[PDB]
Amino acid sequence: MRPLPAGLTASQQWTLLEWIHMAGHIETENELKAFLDQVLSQAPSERLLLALGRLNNQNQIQRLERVLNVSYPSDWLDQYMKENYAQHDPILRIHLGQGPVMWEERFNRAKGAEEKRFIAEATQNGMGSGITFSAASERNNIGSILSIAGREPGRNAALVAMLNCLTPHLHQAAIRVA
- Shortest distance (Å) from residue 10 CB to ligand HL0: 32
Give CA–CA dist 86/80, Å, rounded.
7
Could you tell which of ligand HL0, a copy of itself, none binds residue 139, using a CB distance below 5 to 8 A set by kind? a copy of itself
CA dihedral sign of residues 97, 103, 107, 113: positive
Q: Which residues in this chain contact a copy of itself in the complex, by CB under 8 A?
A: 1, 4, 10, 13-14, 16-18, 20-25, 27, 137, 139, 165, 168-169, 172, 176
- Shortest distance (Å) from residue 19 CB to ligand HL0: 20
| DSSP string across 37-68 | HHHHTTSS-S-EEEEEEEE-TTS-EEEEEEEE
**Reduced to 3 states, what is the DSSP secondary structure of residue 84?**
coil
Residue at shortest CB range from ligand HL0: 147
- Shortest distance (Å) from residue 171 CB to a copy of itself: 9
- Shortest distance (Å) from residue 22 CB to a copy of itself: 7
**115 Cβ contact partners less than 8 Å away, ≥ 6 residues apart:** 88, 90
Asked if residue 129 binds ligand HL0 (CB under 6 A), the reply is no
Could you tell which of a copy of itself, ligand HL0, none binds residue 113, using a CB distance below 5 to 8 A set by kind? none
User: Could you tell me if 164 and 6 are in contact, meaning their C-beta atoms sit under 8 angstroms apart?
Assistant: no
